[PDB]
Amino acid sequence: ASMYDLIIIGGGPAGLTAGIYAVRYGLDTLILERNEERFRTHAQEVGVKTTITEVLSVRSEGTKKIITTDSGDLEAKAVIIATGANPKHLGVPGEKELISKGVSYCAICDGPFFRNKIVAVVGGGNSAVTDALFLSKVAQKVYLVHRRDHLKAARVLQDRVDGTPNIELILNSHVLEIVGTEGIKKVEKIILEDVNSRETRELSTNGVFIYVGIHPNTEFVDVEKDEGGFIKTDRWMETSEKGIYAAGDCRDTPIWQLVTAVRDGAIAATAAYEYIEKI
Amino acid sequence: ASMYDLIIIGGGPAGLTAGIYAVRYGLDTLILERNSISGLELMERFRTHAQEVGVKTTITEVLSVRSEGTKKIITTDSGDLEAKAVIIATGANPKHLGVPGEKELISKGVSYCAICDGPFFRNKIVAVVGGGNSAVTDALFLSKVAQKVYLVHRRDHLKAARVLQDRVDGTPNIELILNSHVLEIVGTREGIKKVEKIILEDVNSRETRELSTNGVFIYVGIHPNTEFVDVEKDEGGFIKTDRWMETSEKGIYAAGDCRDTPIWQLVTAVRDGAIAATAAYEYIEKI
C-alpha cells in the first residue's frame, strides 16, 4: 500500500468519526493509533483500516503528505490530526503511581467518591478554581494549592473561593510528593513546601486533583498554532497548510466551547473529501 | 411515598446522569419520563447503567411545578409529587415546517441534521430550508458532497453572517431561492419510499415550482420543552441558570438543551446533569 487518500492520526472520538465518514465517502483511509469504547468496534465494522504505530513527523511536498512513522514513510493526499490532548503532570513521586487511587484530573468524574472527605486541588487557573468550588459542594474540606503568590483565575471566582468556608487557599506552595497508605493503596497525604521558606508541610488528604494546564499532542506538526500548541483552523477544520486538517482537543477552540470531537471529525472528513476529489 | 429528595424531569442523557450521580450521593431520587450521531446504542446503556445504579423511573406527564417553603410540588396527570429539589432535563426538539409529507418522510429523505446524513447524500440532490447561520453553514457543508443544493428561505434576504453568504455565492452547485415557501414534500410512488420532490411557492407572485430532490433538511428554529415550568427564561423559552445549573428558583435546576446553553452536544448534557445533581445535593444538605 503505502499510498492513501486520507490518513487520520489519532484513534479518539474525533479520528474514529472522521474514519467512518471518510470510508462511507469511499476514500482509501488509514487510522494511526498509538495503543489499544464501542466506537472502535463500530468503526472496524464500517471497514476502517487501523495500524498500531506512532507518528514522528509530517511533511507536505507537491500536494502530497509524508507521514513518517516507526514502520516507514507513508503517503497521503490529505491528513487529519485527531491526537487529542493530555493533562499536564505535576511530575512528583506518587502522581503516576496513585492514579485512579486518589489522584485524578477530573473533579466532575470523581465527585461522589469524595463526599464528606478531605481533598486537595493543585493549580491557579479558572479550571483549578472552578473545580475546587465544585468539590467544596460535596467534600468536607478542600485545599487549593498554587505555586504563585496570587491566583491567575478571574476575580469573580477568587471571590467565591474566599466566600466558601470549607476551601483553604494555600499560595506560594509547590507539591513535593503524593504519599499513599498498608492496603488498599490509596492517597493518604501530600507533602508541601513553601517556595520562599523551604518549610515542609504535611496535609492529610483522601484525593488530589491536578489542574496545571493541558498539553495538546501536536509537536509533530508544523502548522500554525496558538500559545499552547493547539492547532488553528477554519470552520472546516482546515489548518494553515492546505490539505491538512485538525479535529478534537488538539484544535484551537474558545474557552466557553467544550468537546466537539465528533462534529470536528465529521466535518474534517467531508472537507478532506472535497479537497481530494479536486486533486 | 409522595415525598422524595430529588425529582428529575426527563430521561435523557442529562437526566439519567443526574440520577446516577444523585444516587451515588445517597439521595432518594425519582425520574419522570415521557415514553452520538455517528450511529450508536449509547442511550440504552444509560438506562441499564442507571437501573443497576439504582435510580427510580416512572412514566408520567408533568403539568406544573410550584414551590411551597423549600418544598417542591410536581403535579402530574397521575397525581401530585413532593421533593426537596427538582432538575429540569426535558431537552429540546427542532421546529417542524408543518407541511404535507414532512412527518411521513422523516428518516426517508427529510432530516434536521445535515452533518449526520452527509455520506448518504453524496452525489445526490438536496434541499435546505432556512436562512440562519445553521441552514447556510449546512448548505455549504452539503455542497461539498452533494451534486446540487437548493437553499430555500421565505424572506427576501438571508439572515446569516456575510462571510457565509459570500461563500454561498459560488459555490456553483448551490442555488439560492429567496421569497420562497414550501407547500409540500412528496415521496416516491414507485420503489422504496423516499423523498422525490418538493413544491415551492413564491411569496410575492404565488408562482409554484417543482424541484426534484433526494432530501430536505429543515432549519427553522429549536423548541425547548419548558412551557410547563414558570422559572425565568429567555425569548427562546430556554431556562436561565448560573454556572451550577440553578434556575431562578432556589432548589430547582436545569440541564441539557432545555437550558440556555452555549453548546447542544451530548458531553455538555452529561456534564450539566452531573453538576446539577451535586448542586442539588449541596442544597438538600444545607436545608
Automatic annotation (TrEMBL), chain A:
Name of the protein in its database record: Thioredoxin reductase
Any single Gene Ontology cellular-component annotation: cytoplasm
Disulphide-bonded residues: C106-C109
Entries under NCBIfam families matching the protein: TRX_reduct
Any GO BP: removal of superoxide radicals
Organism: Methanosarcina mazei (strain ATCC BAA-159 / DSM 3647 / Goe1 / Go1 / JCM 11833 / OCM 88) (Methanosarcina frisia)
Pfam families: Pyr_redox_2 (PF07992)
Keywords: Disulfide bond, FAD, Flavoprotein, Oxidoreductase, Redox-active center
